[PDB]
Amino acid sequence: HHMKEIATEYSFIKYTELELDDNGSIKQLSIPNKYNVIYAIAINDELVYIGKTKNLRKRINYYRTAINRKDKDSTKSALIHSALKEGSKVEFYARQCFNLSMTNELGTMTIATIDLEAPLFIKLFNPPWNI
């Protein structure tokens, strides 16, 4: 699946493209954060993964460092690093989701719509990295 066509149709915005610095480590982000999104990982404009997260910058930090964390499954982190070393384009796209809550005499029940959309998107696109 070509990313740019999925982006237009399902309202994903390009959030960032990862780049290696002078010494081969992934440059950290210095752009505004996004919360409660479905994210798509694209390699060379091909959709490879559909994810969900409450904090996009935090998630991307995780992908940035996962394979280097001795204290800690970091396969996706490994693949992102490998792809960057070969010179492939790695991008994160984000689709904005929401929180819905109802408060009755039982208290508050909340639903993060990312929880609903992730499975539908994964079934819809069958991304390679989604197993």
Added chain:
Amino acid sequence: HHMKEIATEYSFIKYTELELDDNGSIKQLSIPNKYNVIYAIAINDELVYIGKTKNLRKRINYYRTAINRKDKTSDSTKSALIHSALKEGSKVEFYARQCFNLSMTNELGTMTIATIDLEAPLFIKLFNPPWNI
């Protein structure tokens, strides 16, 4: 407009019966309060009015005291009809249906709705209660 049937199928629960004290005013209640409810007023087991309120105890106290018209600009017509009913020996009951709150949060913040705002107009069109407009 039979209250008993309506109560069952729409989960209205009888909240209180009103009555006059020796001075011709409505007795105070000693009942746990209820909040964010659709309320129904029934007279001799017949539905006469559908309302909504955030605070049922407060609303009922409003009907209790509105007759005295401390606030000349407040609507005292329903209070007047309630006192007339009691004066004529009729039974006056309040029923309450419990509603809730719905919220949604986006990048900006939180929009919240009390469902009484959604249900009230629908109940009024559905029942066409005598005291509603």
Added chain:
Amino acid sequence: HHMKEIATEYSFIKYTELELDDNGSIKQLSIPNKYNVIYAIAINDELVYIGKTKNLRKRINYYRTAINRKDKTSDSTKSALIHSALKEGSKVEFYARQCFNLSMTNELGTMTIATIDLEAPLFIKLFNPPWNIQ
């Protein structure tokens, strides 16, 4: 956990009562139907069970039938508990709390939730009714 207080706090409305006849049969139930609810079983006014159902008249009659037929293939612990309550001469009541549905639609289609699915777990954690196997 007393059913009187629970019923008012959570708007449980009494739906029906079960009763044995002279030869020990659960009399028939003349009751309108009630769909999509949390139901409560009360024994001597005390909450013993929180259930959920798409169709309450059907669920109750299931209980009645299993007991009258002495059917033990049912996954029948509850039916067996109800019958011994009845036999011990206790009062057996069902209450219902009306629930509803929530739907959301976007380009992915329509997502929907029956609130009974949300409430049952919370009532069980709240009251720990005896008959609810956790």
Added chain:
Amino acid sequence: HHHMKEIATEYSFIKYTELELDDNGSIKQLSIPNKYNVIYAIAINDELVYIGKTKNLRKRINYYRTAINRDSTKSALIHSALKEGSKVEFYARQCFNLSMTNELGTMTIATIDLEAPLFIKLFNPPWNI
């Protein structure tokens, strides 16, 4: 004057289409898939000029394309901008419908109805009088 690109990323407005004139000076027809239940933004030379809401985007844009030919102020403003050689784009933020069904039947809330007023207040676009 808010720059469309800033708004786009911050509030997830995606570029929907750029209007073009045909040789007869008429606005070309839309060729892209439709979108429903959106907040739309009108941008002229990358500047936000208007925030609106619609259940059917192609329908609304078609209205702007044909309105002056039949209050059609915005339509007229869009035509003059295009004739002046200015870039005119529509951006869209995807919204949704929520429904509740109980004993009363079905009550529905369209989020475009919630979000439109907030964006208009937030950005205070020139065309939003």
